[PDB]
């Protein structure tokens, strides 16, 4: 189990670690998070008590280095940093654990929620969507735009999601206009899966990362990308059976985790009604359709 | 965006534009079968593609063979319309290509946008105008060429005859929409108004009768009376 120590907590802040969250008081003796499960990516996220503007946070994998958080009073945020000195890092963590100045990642043994949300998400793929190659961890916030949003403005601070545009020459073969617009199988299987993603795992990894950035940061462009990747599958007549069965699991756990009170801002009525009730795959998402009908029947 | 009464003069400026009306592309008669079920029989249709400034009409005749063994014909008809308008634009020299295509029905927007991806600078727009272009098949010479077609054909007309020698394109369009609205509302009464007097004929190379300026005023008044008379009958008003 790995540890993200904190230098201090000089400003009152709600701290997120994956799907969990904790309130820390101004100058409270808080020195970080221990017992973080090895084997998954994680996200540590922040919302300041005195300015709920900019949710922000860091995607990381404790297998890739020793990371800690330090408040920067100039830039006014909690920053993730890497410690290259292993013995210094172990000595700081040991001191904080002995003084019980750390919260424990509160995982229930029965509880596969975080695995179910991050099954296909890998740090190397996050670092290609979020470009800052000098760090092994990835900063995301509420306001960051996507490459596609910027096309329709600082490119270094952008989310490089794969551009999906149903009315683009990439999506429509000359001579197959009606076929390709009404059945997106070409666009899904040849252009996206065989061409850009190489396999369904990379496609699902990006879809899962988009959802988590939408949910944890209220990142609007991430929400658009999540819905576009759902709609591209549901709008395709020809999808491998394993991909449909896996999409149903992926979406079920996303819909299960979503805060009930955020459904109005995180769920697109048009996309979900189309995917569940009109699309080629309207009958392929049994688990997702049942949880959506029982939890958010007003959206539908 | 959408074309309405706020931007009506835009139709007669010097930016090439076309109206596309798909109403008459897929046309059927509905009839009983021997077993007492119902069946459709397609008849020849047409795309109505009009330059409202010049009167140039690109009438693409849709022959019934294009529907043979096809499904969801009302959906296909929109895509076939977009395919043929796209083909017409590509057939025109660059300086004759439209800068805007206005579709009379909003269901034509996505099919035309997708067929015109290669032309990102041609704007595809809906209109809030209710234009009577469905009544095109009430113009005897347009009906005759559509019904006689034995294969796909494009026929070029000037829907204003020689009117632009005497009137502006705004006035020519107003006269056309009034004639087509009257033909749509009461075809028999409109044709009686147009053809009753046998001393006024239609030139071989025209669509409408050779009315003098004063006779056009009389005809236009009789068309307005027809439309009001019919509105009084519909609503008992």
Q: Are residues A166 and A218 in the same domain?
A: yes
The minimum CA-CA distance between B68 and chain A, rounded to whole Å, is 17
Breaks in chain B, after residue numbers (C to N greater than 2.5 Å)? none
The dihedral built from the CA positions of residue B172, B173, B178 and B183, taken in this order, carries a sign that is positive
CA dist., res. B75 & res. B55, Å (int) = 29
Q: Are residues A81 and A178 in the same domain?
A: no
Q: Which domains does chain B have, with CATH numbers?
A: 9-163 (3.30.420.230), 164-237 (1.20.80.40)
Q: Are residues A103 and A36 in the same domain?
A: yes
CA dist., res. A53 & res. A60, Å (int) = 23
Q: Are residues A167 and A109 in the same domain?
A: no
Q: Are residues A135 and A4 in the same domain?
A: yes
Domain boundary among the residues A125, A143, A161 is at A143
Contacts of B116 in chain A (CB under 8 A): none
CA nearest neighbour of B207 among B190, B194, B188: B194
Residue A236 · residue A280 · CB < 8 Å: yes
Residue positions counted in chain A: 300
* Residues of the domain holding A260: 144-300
Interface contacts (A, B; CB < 8 Å)? 24
Contacts of B115 in chain A (CB under 8 A): 177
Q: Are residues A30 and A54 in the same domain?
A: yes
Q: Measured in whole angstroms, how far is the alpha carbon of residue B120 from the centre of its chain?
A: 25
Q: What is the largest CA-CA distance in chain A?
A: 70
Residue positions counted in chain B: 237
Q: Are residues A178 and A254 in the same domain?
A: yes
Say whether A289 sits in a helix, a strand or coil: helix
Q: How far is CA B198 from CA A7, B163, B204, B209, in A?
A: 101, 21, 15, 10
Please check whether residue A167 touches B, CB under 8 A: yes
Please check whether residue A172 touches B, CB under 8 A: yes
Please check whether residue A73 touches B, CB under 8 A: no
Does A174 sit within 8 Å of B115, measured CB to CB?
no
Q: Are residues A196 and A247 in the same domain?
A: yes
Q: Measured in whole angstroms, how far is the alpha carbon of residue A284 from the centre of its chain?
A: 24
Residue B105 exposed, middle or buried by CB count within 10 Å (0-12, 13-18, 19+): middle
DSSP B106: G
Please name the method used to determine this structure: X-ray
Say whether B41 sits in a helix, a strand or coil: strand
Residue B147 · residue B44 · CB < 8 Å: yes
Contacts of A177 in chain B (CB under 8 A): 79, 82-83, 111, 114-115
Residue A273 exposed, middle or buried by CB count within 10 Å (0-12, 13-18, 19+): middle
DSSP B128: S
Q: How many CB atoms lie within 10 A of CB A109?
A: 4
Does A181 sit within 8 Å of B117, measured CB to CB?
no
Resolution (A): 1.5
Residue B19 · residue B49 · CB < 8 Å: yes
Residue B220: what are its φ and ψ, rounded to 5°?
-55, -45
* A70, β-bridge pairs: A79
Residue A165 exposed, middle or buried by CB count within 10 Å (0-12, 13-18, 19+): middle
Instruction: Supply A166's token pair.
Output: 């149903």
Residue B100 · residue B15 · CB < 8 Å: yes
Please give the residue of chain B at the shortest CA–CA distance from A178: B79
Alpha helices per DSSP H over B17-139: 73-91, 109-115
Q: Are residues A104 and A246 in the same domain?
A: no
* B123, β-bridge pairs: B100
Does A168 sit within 8 Å of B114, measured CB to CB?
no
Q: Are residues A121 and A151 in the same domain?
A: no
CA dist., res. A176 & res. A149, Å (int) = 27
Sorted by sequence, the CB contacts under 8 Å of residue A92 that are 6+ apart come out as: A5, A68, A83
Please provide the DSSP assignment of A21-81 as one string.
EEEE-TT----EEEEEPTTS-EEEEEEESS--S--EEEEE-GGG-EEEEEEETTTTEEEEE
Per the structure, the count of domains in chain A is: 2
Residue A268 exposed, middle or buried by CB count within 10 Å (0-12, 13-18, 19+): middle
Please check whether residue A169 touches B, CB under 8 A: yes
Q: Are residues A68 and A108 in the same domain?
A: yes
Virtual torsion, Cα A197, A202, A203, A206, nearest 10 deg: -120
- Residue A86: which H helix or E strand, with range? helix A86-98
- Residue B18: which H helix or E strand, with range? strand B17-21
Breaks in chain A, after residue numbers (C to N greater than 2.5 Å)? 152
Does A177 sit within 8 Å of B83, measured CB to CB?
yes
Residue B161: what are its φ and ψ, rounded to 5°?
45, -125
Q: Are residues A77 and A181 in the same domain?
A: no
CATH of the domain at A104: 2.60.34.20
Domain boundary among the residues A143, A160, A190 is at A143
């Amino acid at each position: 189990m790995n540890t993200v120590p904190f230098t201090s907590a000089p400003i009152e802040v709600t701290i997120g670690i994956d799907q969990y969250s904790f309130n820390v008081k101004e100058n409270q003796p808080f020195h970080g998070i221990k017992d973080i499960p090895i084997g998954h990516v994680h996200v540590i996220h922040f919302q300041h008590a005195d300015n709920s503007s900019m949710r922000y946070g860091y995607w990381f994998d404790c297998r890739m280095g020793n990371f800690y958080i330090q408040y920067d009073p100039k830039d006014g945020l909690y920053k993730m940093m890497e410690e290259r000195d292993g013995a210094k890092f172990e000595n700081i963590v040991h001191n904080f654990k002995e003084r019980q100045m750390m919260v424990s990642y509160p995982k229930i043994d029965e509880d596969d929620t975080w695995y179910n949300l991050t099954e296909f998400v890998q740090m190397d793929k996050i670092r290609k969507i979020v470009r800052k190659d000098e760090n092994q961890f990835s900063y995301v916030d509420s306001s960051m735009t996507t490459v596609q949003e910027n096309e329709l403005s600082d490119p270094a601070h952008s989310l490089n999601y794969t551009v999906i545009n149903f009315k683009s020459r990439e999506a429509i073969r000359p001579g197959h206009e009606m076929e390709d617009f009404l059945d997106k199988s070409y666009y899904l299987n040849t252009v996206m899966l065989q061409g850009i993603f190489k396999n369904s795992s990379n496609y699902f990894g990006e879809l899962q990362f988009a959802f988590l950035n939408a949910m944890f940061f209220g990142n609007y462009g991430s929400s658009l990308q999540w819905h576009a990747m759902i709609e591209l599958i549901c709008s395709s007549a020809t999808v491998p059976k394993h991909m449909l069965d896996k999409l149903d699991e992926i979406l079920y756990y996303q819909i299960k985790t979503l805060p009930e009170q955020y459904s109005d801002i995180l769920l697109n009525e048009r996309v979900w009604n189309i995917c569940l009730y009109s699309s080629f795959q309207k009958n392929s998402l049994h688990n997702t359709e049942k949880i959506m009908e029982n939890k958010y029947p007003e959206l539908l | 965006g959408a074309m309405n009464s706020s931007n009506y003069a835009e139709l007669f400026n010097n930016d090439i534009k076309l109206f596309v009306d798909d109403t008459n592309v897929y046309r059927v008669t509905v009839h009983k079968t021997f077993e007492g079920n119902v069946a459709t029989k397609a008849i020849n249709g047409c795309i109505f593609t009009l330059n409202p400034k010049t009167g140039h009409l690109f009438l693409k005749i849709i022959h019934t063979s294009v529907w043979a063994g096809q499904k969801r014909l009302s959906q296909l008809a929109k895509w076939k319309t977009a395919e043929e308008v796209s083909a017409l634009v590509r057939s025109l020299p660059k300086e004759e290509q439209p800068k805007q295509i206005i579709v009379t029905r909003k269901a034509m927007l996505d099919p035309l946008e997708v067929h015109m991806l290669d032309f990102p600078n041609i704007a595809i727009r809906p209109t809030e105008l209710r234009l009577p272009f469905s009544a095109a098949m009430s113009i005897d010479k347009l009906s005759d060429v559509v019904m006689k077609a034995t294969e796909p054909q494009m026929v070029l007309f000037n829907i204003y005859d020689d009117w632009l020698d005497r009137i502006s394109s705004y006035t020519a369009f107003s006269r056309l929409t009034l004639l087509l609205r009257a033909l749509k509302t009461n075809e028999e009464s409109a044709k009686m108004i147009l053809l009753s007097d046998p001393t006024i004929t239609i030139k071989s190379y025209h669509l409408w009768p050779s009315f003098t300026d004063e006779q056009w005023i009389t005809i236009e008044s009789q068309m307005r009376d027809l439309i009001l008379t019919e509105y009084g009958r519909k609503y008992n008003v």
